[PDB]
Paper text:
We purified the C-terminal CBD of Myosin VI and Tom1 MBM complex, and successfully obtained good crystals that diffracted to 1.80 Å resolution. Further detailed structure analyses of the binding interface of Myosin VI/Tom1 complex revealed that the specific interaction between the C-terminal CBD of Myosin VI and Tom1 MBM is mainly mediated by extensive hydrophobic and polar interactions.
As a unique myosin motor, Myosin VI can not only serve as a processive dimer or oligomer for vesicular transport and cargo sorting, but also function as a nonprocessive monomeric anchor or tether to link its binding cargoes with cytoskeletons for the establishment and maintenance of highly specialized cellular structures. A previous study revealed that Tom1 can directly interact with Myosin VI through its uncharacterized C-terminal region, and was proved to be a crucial adaptor to mediate endosomal localization of Myosin VI12. In this study, we systematically characterize the interactions of Myosin VI with Tom1 and three autophagy receptors, NDP52, TAX1BP1, and Optineurin, and discover that the C-terminal region of Tom1 contains a conserved Myosin VI-binding motif shared by all Tom1 family members, which can specifically interact with the C-terminal CBD of Myosin VI to form a stable heterodimeric complex.
Numbering used by the authors:
A (entry chain C): 437 to 463
B (entry chain A): 1158 to 1177, 1188 to 1282
Write the structure that this text describes.
């Protein structure tokens, strides 16, 4: 079974989006 | 207590880049099969620190065996490689505050701060 690793992939993609709300250090 | 945890649950640490250039990084500390700490470092952003209990909704819900992390060549790292970055980002105060406020689930990491 590698549905679960697919699930881990989807999880990482949503986490990767979780930072776009964060301020830039540069400005 | 730290040893009883140690001596029954292997502590394992991983780091992998995020998908789309500079990459962001996803770090994890697994206390046996279940995640205890998670840390996300994006270019030109403040770090995201996450501890079991308080931040469950943002953390990996999979058993370690299910993630495929143990089968990705190069994903596993030394405990100290995780710790140095966790500590640099303020992870000790973060977890300590979560413990103080009764938001942190007891893990090997909290046992580490019981000192």
């Amino acid at each position: 079974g590698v549905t679960s690793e697919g699930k881990f992939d989807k999880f990482l993609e949503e986490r990767a989006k979780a930072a776009d709300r964060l301020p830039n250090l540069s400005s | 207590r730290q040893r009883e945890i140690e001596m029954n649950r292997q502590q394992r640490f991983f780091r992998i880049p995020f998908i789309r250039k500079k990459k962001g990084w996803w770090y994890a500390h697994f206390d046996g099969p279940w995640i205890a700490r998670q840390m996300e470092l994006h270019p030109d952003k403040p770090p995201i620190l996450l501890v079991a209990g308080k931040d469950d909704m943002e953390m990996c819900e999979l058993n370690l065996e299910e993630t495929g992390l143990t089968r990705k060549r190069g994903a596993e790292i030394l405990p100290r490689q995780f710790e140095e970055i966790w500590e640099r980002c303020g992870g000790i105060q973060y977890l300590q505050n979560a413990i103080e406020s009764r938001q942190a689930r007891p893990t090997y990491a909290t046992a580490m701060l019981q000192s």
